[PDB]
Amino acid sequence: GMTATELVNAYYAAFNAGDMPAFLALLSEDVIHDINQGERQMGKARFAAFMEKMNRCYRERLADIVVMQNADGSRAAAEFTVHGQYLADDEGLPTANGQTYVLPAGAFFYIHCGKIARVTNYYNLNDWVEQVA
């Protein structure tokens, strides 16, 4: 019975708290995940693997979260500020040494049957690389 706004708020609450069971529970089994400047990854197993890797390499807190939805709650969007620390080398990227970064980001969502069926992530990758390189 959650609204789209509530669902997306719960997504980010779980993200911020590092509560992976709560986070993954909100996603459909066939969730589409559009990685910023990267590949479309399909399915919850791949999303769980993505989060495992992200948790190996980064810690992030999202601030200033603004969540919006369409009237029927099938579509949503969020804009926020990422506060992060780069903890361990991620593949294909600059070396990690604990550096901090701060940058705006956003996401778009498709919601169906009360689950998040698509997450599309956006941010300026060039800005992030400049901050950590």
Place this chain on the structure above:
Amino acid sequence: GMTATELVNAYYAAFNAGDMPAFLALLSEDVIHDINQGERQMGKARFAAFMEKMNRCYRERLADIVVMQNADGSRAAAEFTVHGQYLADDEGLPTANGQTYVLPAGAFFYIHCGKIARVTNYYNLNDWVEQVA
């Protein structure tokens, strides 16, 4: 007296119709323009110059536009599908030869005093380059 939704709909109507006076009229004089994977450009004059260049090099139609806002209309977001044709070489990018492209994109907005005060553009640049290269 327009709502944020109406304002953003007018922005995209003007974009789609190629009506530059109508498009630029919606923007604040000090509009912040966050170019996808690029620079923050400040001010309406720079935005007009950006559009002049864009119009020199591309023709785009946006489909499937979904516009969302926060309750007070200070923030908005749009997701859509870009249908484009690359008409003339743009600087720092692959050669143009009239190729077509289709890809999702989105934008985030800050609205103040009834004008668009920030436009932040997002899309997968790698996907676009792959489509035209």
